[PDB]
Structure 1
């Protein structure tokens, strides 16, 4: 499939070095993959990042995929240790498992140079992402087919888009002002971008999940909506296109948002560009 994401196709020119470094990093962290090409996503989602900034993007994205593998009692203990690490400002110890040590390695770089306000809202977003994995284990043990709305609510946590939007600020060199970042206008752009990425992800892994018995949005629409296979696919496609259209309507109101809140328009367009670039990056990599 191909959608009209409002951003040109781009890739970072420093992808060769970053990929090679990252494979040494997962080895040094005792985490391991290289053949899945999941590492390259960092260079597609942040096409202007180079050097250490790109390394952080590749490290964080690679970690999420390896964190997901932990679920495919020990994983629940990691969720609790990571939560306390973030809430209480701790760092990994000598008894921490490799997945926790690796995350602390990322978080120390990610939080450096950022304000307390930015750290506060990013910590909350990291913990809300962690909250979705106990749900994954419970639903798998239950064995029931989630209804479409319940599948999307759970996936909005595990997709990990909001922590990665905060990362765009960190590597871009700016912070969206507080009064503007919390507005429903910008939160709607984060939500619509997440819907699009989820829709794309559900269409890419459809055949694999159906053959392995895993959950998928398309299968939930067939089971609960009475739709056929072809109908459920078109339904998910409409979600991606509608989310893109909704994102574009929200963006057209940023000049008035800046005037109302007294915020420089430049930073607002830079933030909107980052969200669009991430969605486009995931689209191209997935294809």
Structure 2
């Protein structure tokens, strides 16, 4: 599926290691129990993914992203059954996990939940408060959507799987890992927001053509396709990136506009290249077909 993402692909020089100790965390958290589930997990190349979403994270930082990614797919597995077919139900879990953004949870709490909590802890630990509060809301929306999606008892779809995809939490993570924050003043910008929306959509599209042969065979008929549709999807991605660049260029000017500091300007730059860009190129540098 030849696309048009005029952006350099990166991988964190540490992944070497990372991908090797990747099981450690989840096994201890109870997310992986049988030697089979560990294998299953390895075949997913989640550490390999995180390493592409966070080229700038080396070791202790990279590891976290590996987990977030790692946790992402495990968590999803929990809704592949009939639970993903009844909103009331999914939310029963949703809140147990999401409760971690409020404070410690009773041991009684499932592992998938204790798992998320440990990620959060380390993720939000060391960032400004205003940030965690934001980075959290985002998570909140992620969770919210899994329910709204479970409301299954064209563009209408995006709004739906716009929060479910979980792209933002990932992007957020780039900052978590990169030990830096985009000047909050700009992350709210009409431009940056526009840039982010794209990152999402692009991912939300690439994914749909890869997990197609699977979703086409089974039920789930919400996938963006349901050979021509493929085209205006390959096309849509083109224009999406094509514009991404246009936006990217207005960035410096956006700097003036928000009287951006002598060093906030550098911070934002990190965001463009290490958070928003990667999250796009990386998704692509993963698939096959």
In the alignment, what sits opposite 1:194?
A: 200
Q: Are residues 1:21 and 2:27 paired?
A: no
Q: 2: CA distance between counterparts of 1:282 and 1:216?
A: 20
| Contact 1:38-1:62 within 8 A present in 2 as well | yes
- Deviation of 1:74 after TM superposition, in Å, equals 5.5
Comparing both structures, which one devotes a greater share of its residues to helix? 1
In the alignment, what sits opposite 2:60?
A: 52
In the alignment, what sits opposite 1:145?
A: none
The one of 78, 82, 85 aligned to 2:97 = 82
- Deviation of 1:3 after TM superposition, in Å, equals 2.2
- Structure 1, unaligned runs of 5 or more: 142-147, 221-229
In the alignment, what sits opposite 2:109?
A: 96
What pairs up with 1:1-287 in 2 under 5 angstroms?
1-32=1-32, 33-72=41-80, 75-86=90-101, 88=102, 90-139=103-152, 141=153, 148-220=154-226, 230-263=227-260, 264-274=264-274, 275-287=276-288
In the alignment, what sits opposite 1:226?
A: none
CA RMSD of aligned residues (A): 1.6
Q: 1: CA distance between counterparts of 2:222 and 2:243?
A: 24
Secondary structure at 1:157 match in 2? coil
| Contact 1:202-1:216 within 8 A present in 2 as well | no
| Contact 2:187-2:193 within 8 A present in 1 as well | yes
| Contact 2:183-2:268 within 8 A present in 1 as well | no
- Once the two structures are superposed, residues 200-257 of structure 1 have per-residue CA deviations (whole angstroms, 9 ceiling, x without a partner) of 001111111111122343443xxxxxxxxx2111121122112111211111011111
Q: 2: CA distance between counterparts of 1:273 and 1:203?
A: 26
Off by >6 Å, runs of 4+ in structure 1: none
Secondary structure at 2:112 match in 1? helix
Secondary structure at 1:252 match in 2? helix
**Pair 234,54 (structure 1): closer, same or farther in 2 beyond 3 Å:** same
- Deviation of 1:12 after TM superposition, in Å, equals 1.5
- Structure 2, unaligned runs of 5 or more: 33-40, 81-87
